[PDB]
Amino acid sequence: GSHSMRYFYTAMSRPGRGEPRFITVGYVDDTLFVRFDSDATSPRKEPRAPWIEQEGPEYWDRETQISKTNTQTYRENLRTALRYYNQSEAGSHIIQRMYGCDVGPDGRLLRGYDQYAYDGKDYIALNEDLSSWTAADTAAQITQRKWEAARVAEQDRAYLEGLCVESLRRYLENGKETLQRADPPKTHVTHHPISDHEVTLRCWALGFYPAEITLTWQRDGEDQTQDTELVETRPAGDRTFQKWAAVVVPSGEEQRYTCHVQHEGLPKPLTLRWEP
């Protein structure tokens, strides 16, 4: 199927509690594979998946150096953002970055990203064209002009079309037995009366990977979107995910309802019912 690689940075100032903390986490799809934390005794990029462990010492040195330099750069970025927003030195602030690439089944680039946020709001983002920027406001326009003069977008485009795609191809192969294995959801429908004349039908999906799934209820074949209670997809802690969808139905009419499940791990989409 299709895959993503993403790096996520968080830089968080903490006046009175030391210098700003810098963290990087790297993912392939929903699998964490590397982490860096400036608060560690020996700050370094650490492997978090067995398929990256096989990377040699030259990989860890290069990756650690990028993150050590980023710790210093992002502390500067936090001071610049404070100045651009006329803020005092007393409060805690956060810069986030998410960058990386999506590829299709043929390994080719679908799209790239390089997005930044300040205090949970958009700051600046590379457009999908990989050649221009969207600055959220007049503060971020200053960074935009600096990055336009330094031809940052051209450098991002080269990385996103090149090393991003190539390292995702390498990682997907080295980790093919996990990264390229879609685990289908294990499903069941529960029944709970809510009154003498209505019941809850809850359709469960457990043990699936990746997180992407569609769970819907139908009445005679019609979608019940506005009357379905959904929970956000949640991690089980063993790499897999969980989700449920529930509908309130008249007692004695349970057989009119079908739960529909779509997931990459299934040979065919499922159509389920409550089994009394």
């Binding site: 790096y7 990028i66 330099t69 750069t73 500067e76 610049t80 600096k146 450098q155 990385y159 991003c164």
Partner: peptide, 9 residues
């Protein structure tokens, strides 16, 4: 592999 290029805000 991360991008090694860096320039501040």
């Amino acid at each position: 592999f991360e991008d090694l290029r860096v320039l501040s805000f």
